[PDB]
Assembly symmetry: D2
């Protein structure tokens, strides 16, 4: 239990990678607060995986596009569990569209969730975080390799986290708080399943030749959130089966 007595906040915790990160942090001993936007039933099942195995959880309905709601969620977590040790920013939106075609709505909405809300949550968490804490952003290997058309705005929104991570590391390093950007490649989830022509296309660009599992992203996040990782900061850390080699 390397996270015994720690408090973690996970933005986007109810499905896919987020759900795996909540369960893993809780299995190492952290109390976990997490946000969800879409499904109370998915959130309940995550919360039950935490407690059936003896961990402490708080599920919070909060739309990551709304600045006020996110800051409110972080304060609710703090009232519930005390000051945060760990923040994981896992909210993320994807719309495909060419430069000439993408709707201005769709732009605004990737910026809101993938960028704005990462800063918004980081700022409120930082105001209620213990020294020696950990902020982990979940980015994308598309910050580094964009092999096809249609991903301009999504890649932009994920490459934004590179500079964010560097400058946050400088800001919070005097408090011994680490800040890192985890950059996954394709991960097998319901909305991006390891099945079909697109997945084969993507697997051809990878050195490993399978999609990543949620548990593997979770494992890396947990390592970074842990007592062994106090010297890793400002880094963008690829976990992508060699997609970006």
């Amino acid at each position: 239990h390397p996270l015994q007595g720690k408090v973690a906040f996970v933005q986007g915790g109810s499905r896919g990678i987020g759900a795996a990160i909540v369960k893993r942090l809780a299995s190492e001993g952290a109390a976990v607060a997490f946000t969800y936007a879409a499904s109370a039933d998915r959130a309940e099942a995550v919360a039950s995986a935490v407690t059936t195995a003896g961990g402490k959880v708080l599920a919070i309905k909060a739309d990551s596009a709304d600045a006020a709601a996110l800051q409110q969620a972080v304060r609710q977590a703090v009232s519930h569990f005390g000051n945060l040790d760990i923040l994981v920013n896992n909210a993320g939106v994807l719309t495909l569209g060419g430069t000439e075609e993408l709707a201005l709505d769709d732009l605004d909405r990737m910026l809101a969730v993938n960028v704005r809300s990462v800063f918004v949550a980081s700022q409120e968490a930082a105001r209620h975080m213990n020294d020696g804490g950990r902020i982990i952003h979940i980015g994308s290997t598309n910050a580094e390799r964009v092999p096809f058309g249609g991903a301009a705005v999504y890649a932009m929104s994920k490459s934004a986290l590179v500079g964010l991570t560097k400058g946050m590391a400088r800001d919070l390093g005097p408090r011994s708080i680490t800040v890192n950007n985890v950059q996954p490649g394709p991960v097998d989830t319901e909305m991006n399943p390891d099945a079909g022509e697109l997945a084969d296309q993507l697997k051809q660009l990878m050195a490993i030749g399978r999609y990543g599992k949620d548990e593997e992203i979770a494992g890396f996040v947990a390592y970074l959130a842990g007592p062994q990782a106090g010297y890793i900061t400002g880094a963008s850390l690829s976990i992508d089966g060699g997609f970006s080699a």
Copy 2:
């Protein structure tokens, strides 16, 4: 006159690097349309440097924070000069603030100008651009090196252009349109003068030991906008006196 007969649009053309880029493009033969937000007198002086030396210019008042106004400006340019060959996105806002302190207003406003409006202008220009065109974003060496606190949001907004540039290059490469991100280091302007303690601090991080000149950034932009640069695309290209070495 390597740009004879070309048409260029410069977002933020009335002062500093933007003014130097307008004059240089026009000196190589391009017709230049440029936007300004602040000062009609600065815009008039740029427009006069273009025409006194025999070039063609259109100055457009347009706030880069306003999506509609920017798209309108690009269409006004097109009505005036015909289809664009060259777009330069040089709008840029800077507020210093720590992660824990930065006002949410100030966040929203760097995102609006440094990120959103770069895409907005690129999209409208692309819809009215000739094959074999050129899109040049003006980023920052702070995408790569953030040596002090207080720059988290500014660095984020400039590292955003890395992924934007990569995915735009993929989108527009079939049309033989190049897309590149020029990343300057400190450049001597009125609001960031090469004088005082801050400049000395910054010069100590540089291999060259002076600030860059507007004309030097302009020279590089013009090279990239030219007939020799059709094979440079998707790149983030540092011009920073070794700030990021």
Copy 3:
């Protein structure tokens, strides 16, 4: 003990980060052979073998790998931790120091990696120990050292492609320090054990999806 049944080879394992790596991998149940600088030492019933080999000597490295495999069977893990740092300006550095840094920091990395890959199980791990000087070189005197460490970026990327069909991962761990303090975001040096913890994470069963990556553990030196 997630490495029970596994075999590791550590190029440069007798002091500092190397020693910490050997100690951590052995504590997780690995058998470990390591080089330091034909002679070797071990313990009856123990699973740690110390082999004297200079990392500039191709023959001695290749032999060391083969001795490891003789004792323990195919490798699962290789860690390349040999390293030489000589400061010198471009105008002044002796060609002998150039050649030493190239031999140890670059050549021997490829030599060990090839020999290990000829005797490694599918699902294996190769971890190079690079440096944050590959990305940020803030002072003079480091040109050839930085060169030698930035070489590992390209190597890691191409080796990950080569070996990915065998499910072998290949990663480059880039430490910072283990005048500079103004550059460090967290205001201390790294501990050998910290570097070792990251190596052991990558060497283990949870890291099969991390490959081709250069991964910085440098207190924010390169931010």
Copy 4:
């Protein structure tokens, strides 16, 4: 003729990109010495000197630089364009091909750069010709080539620090090609003249503020 009065040395100047570089620098008014592979050729009244030297031979490179300086005075510009590409998997590459790629692509870059820097004017330019394979290695067989070219990243960064007090810039131009087509954003190969145009821009009076940079000219191969 922005290089009138200037002196350039081009390591590997007899064919393709090297030839185009020599041709462009001379057209801008530079005196140009170049190597190709003690013998040399020139024209009476001309300012282009062709010197036979193998880039793996330290002595011959150092001599070539000194011959250039004998003819033309201190250098203003050096372009390092020698290059060897041998394909081979990690498990199979011959150590001789490793050593050849290390000698030519890495060692000789440092050797020429040091000798040039001992005989160069303040305000000078050093341009290494690297490869986009430093950043993206999409297929197997390129590990050692990629290694050799990613080495230039660190070298460029440290040399720019070393030489910045003398106002000498140091940059690494990374070409892509001059199966792959699916990787290219613009759908053609680059022309030798294009690479040369970029080199000449960096070599010139407008580029004094570009230093330490790795600058990609690769049709979007690495995007």
